[PDB]
């Protein structure tokens, strides 16, 4: 019979027999009984009543009302009356954009934010720095702009790529996100993924290479900042001071992914520093590096996060890590619990939205296909009980942009899988089903076309063309 098409699925929908042809908001009340992230939305033939426990729940209730208005706009016969009582399963529901790989203009970020807010995402993570570019301006380090923000080409295409946000643009983004219920999380990836920083400031590295250029290809860089160099710590203190001014979330993602330690092992400065500190290997050195960085953050009231790299011993109890490596989700849940770490689920089997969504679409010679149906199969807890998985804070989907050069390409791969991620982060398992989700997503094609002039239809051949290979 007649249903709503709200994504994410609300925790409770009680449908009634009457029909509503108006969604005029008749009441909008803050009530003490509901939690601050919760709302109750009642649809009657005379209009709608919204109750919420706080500003956060109110934002979510208005987001549901927006989807119901989009449904009603396409249903002249009216929509069912009913009561929706709703609160998210997980408090962290995030997407990550990758302007380091391909710069995202301010106007395009706005559209990306409006779309994620429509699905009740509440975290926007900015991957600001990598091998292919550096997008955060830092006073006192002008070569980040003149060198690190520019590259000669991408994958042999001969086409230079550059870009850097202004401080005013980033403060605009923060306010734009806050008005839509979204906290912004900057990432300064360290100690690796740093070829762009090396191109600008080779003196920060164990083996300075003045001829180094910003990377124009994918693949792994072995260049790690040298923890023995005072300039490194002065630089990151300056970076973190800018983040304190710009990003009121106070959370700084430090990255830490894909940082092989070969060059630390060989570095003549790091070798003797390890001898002085009685460090037996470079994992102990990595632990000390993160601890020193966390101490710098703590001076500003900031807190770190990391990509989980499978060695829980390098993090400090109470810190948050992101599980991402293929095949490691269950082990990561267990090891982070034992180590006293909090966990965000970003498993690349379900959440890496750079991967093609239909078999036969560009995989660049290595990417597996993650279909919409596969994505929807994600339970962030992997069926584990609360005593084993209560340290999981939520779900997070990166849209890595090595191969996504503009917003058109970004949205093509981000959606509709981001809709499934939204439901995995928000909806209790007891209201989730592929059949129901698929039904609603079909209706959402018209909703998103109407509201955003954007088409979420996916076929193998309708991905925008690429210039490479
Ligand atoms: Zn070194």
From Swiss-Prot:
Top-rank taxon: Bacteria
EC numbers for this chain: 3.2.1.52
Chain residues that bind Zn(2+): 206, 226, 267, 270
Temperature dependence per UniProt: Optimum temperature is 37 degrees Celsius. Retains more than 90% of activity after 96 hours of incubation at 37 degrees Celsius and after 12 hours of incubation at 42 degrees Celsius.
Membrane spanning residue stretches: none
A molecular function (GO) term: beta-N-acetylglucosaminidase activity
InterPro entries in the record: Beta_hexosaminidase_sua/sub, Glyco_hydro_20_cat, Glycoside_hydrolase_SF, Hex-like_dom2, HEX_bac_N
GO CC entries: membrane
Annotated SUPFAM superfamilies: (Trans)glycosidases, beta-N-acetylhexosaminidase-like domain
GO biological process terms, semicolon-separated: chitobiose catabolic process; glycosaminoglycan metabolic process; polysaccharide catabolic process
Pfam families the record matches: Glyco_hydro_20, Glyco_hydro_20b
Record keywords: Carbohydrate metabolism, Glycosidase, Hydrolase, Metal-binding, Polysaccharide degradation, Signal, Zinc
Catalytic activity field: Hydrolysis of terminal non-reducing N-acetyl-D-hexosamine residues in N-acetyl-beta-D-hexosaminides
Binding-site residues, substrate: 101, 257, 324, 352-354, 400-402
Effect of residue 257 to A: No significant change in KM value, but 37-fold and 2600-fold decrease in specific activity and kcat/KM value compared to that of wild-type, respectively
Residues annotated as catalytic: 130 (charge relay system), 193 (charge relay system), 258 (charge relay system)
Function comment: Hydrolyzes terminal GlcNAc residues from terminally unbranched N-glycans and from chitobiose. Hydrolyzes beta-1,6-linked N-acetylglucosamine and beta-1,4-linked N-acetylgalactosamine from pNP-alpha-GalNAc[beta1,3Gal]beta1,6GlcNAc and pNP-beta-GlcNAc-beta1,4-GalNAc substrates, respectively, as well as beta-1,2-linked N-acetylglucosamine units from the non-reducing end of N-glycans. Hydrolyzes GlcNAc residues linked to alpha1,3- or alpha1,6-mannose branch, but has low activity on substrates with more than one GlcNAc residue on one of the mannose branches.
Family, per entry: Belongs to the glycosyl hydrolase 20 family.
Protein name according to UniProt: Beta-hexosaminidase Amuc_2018
Organism: Akkermansia muciniphila (strain ATCC BAA-835 / DSM 22959 / JCM 33894 / BCRC 81048 / CCUG 64013 / CIP 107961 / Muc)
């Amino acid at each position: 019979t007649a249903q709503y098409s709200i994504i994410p699925e609300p925790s409770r929908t009680e449908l009634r027999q009457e029909t509503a042809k108006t969604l005029q908001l008749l009441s909008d009340q803050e009530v003490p009984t509901l939690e601050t992230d919760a709302y109750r939305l009642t649809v009657t033939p005379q209009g709608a009543h919204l109750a919420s426990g706080g500003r956060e729940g109110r934002i979510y209730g208005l987001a549901t009302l927006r989807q119901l208005r989009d449904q009603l706009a396409g249903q002249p016969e009216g929509i069912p009356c009913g009561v929706i009582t709703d609160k998210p399963r997980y408090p962290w529901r995030g997407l990550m954009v990758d302007p380091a790989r391909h710069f995202i203009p301010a106007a395009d970020l706005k559209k990306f934010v409006d779309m994620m807010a429509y699905y009740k995402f509440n975290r926007l993570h900015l991957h600001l720095t990598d091998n292919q570019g550096w997008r955060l301006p830092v006073p006192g380090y002008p070569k980040l702009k003149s060198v690190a923000s520019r590259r000669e080409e991408s994958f042999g295409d001969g086409i230079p790529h550059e870009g850097m946000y202004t401080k005013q643009e980033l403060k605009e983004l923060v306010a734009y996100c806050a008005a839509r219920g979204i906290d912004v999380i900057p990432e300064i990836d360290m100690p690796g993924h740093n070829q762009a920083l090396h191109a600008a400031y080779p003196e920060f590295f164990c083996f300075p290479k003045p001829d180094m250029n910003v990377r124009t290809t994918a693949g792994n860089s072995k260049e790690l900042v040298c923890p023995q160099k005072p300039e490194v710590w002065k630089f990151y203190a300056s970076v973190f001071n800018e983040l304190k001014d710009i990003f009121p979330s106070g959370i700084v993602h430090l990255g830490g992914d894909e940082a092989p330690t070969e060059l630390w092992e060989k570095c003549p400065l790091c070798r003797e520093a390890r001898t002085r500190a009685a460090m037996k290997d470079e994992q102990e050195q990595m632990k000390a590096f993160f601890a020193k960085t966390a101490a710098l953050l703590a001076k500003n009231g900031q807190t770190p996060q990391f990509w989980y790299e499978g060695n829980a011993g390098i993090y400090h109890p109470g810190e948050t890590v992101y599980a991402w490596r293929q095949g490691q989700a269950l082990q990561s849940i267990e090891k982070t619990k034992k180590a006293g770490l909090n966990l965000i689920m970003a498993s690349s089997e379900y959440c890496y939205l750079d991967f093609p969504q239909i078999q036969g679409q560009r995989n660049w010679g290595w990417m597996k296909t993650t279909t919409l149906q596969k994505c929807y199969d994600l339970d962030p807890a992997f069926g584990k009980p609360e005593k084993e998985a209560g340290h999981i804070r939520g779900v997070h989907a990166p849209v890595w942009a090595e191969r996504l050069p503009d917003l058109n390409h970004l949205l093509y791969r981000a959606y509709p899988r981001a809709c499934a991620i939204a439901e995995a982060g928000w909806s209790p398992m007891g209201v989730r089903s592929w059949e129901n989700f698929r039904r609603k997503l079909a209706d959402h094609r018209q909703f998103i076309l109407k509201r955003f002039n954007y088409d979420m239809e996916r076929t193998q051949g309708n991905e925008p063309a690429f210039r490479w290979e």
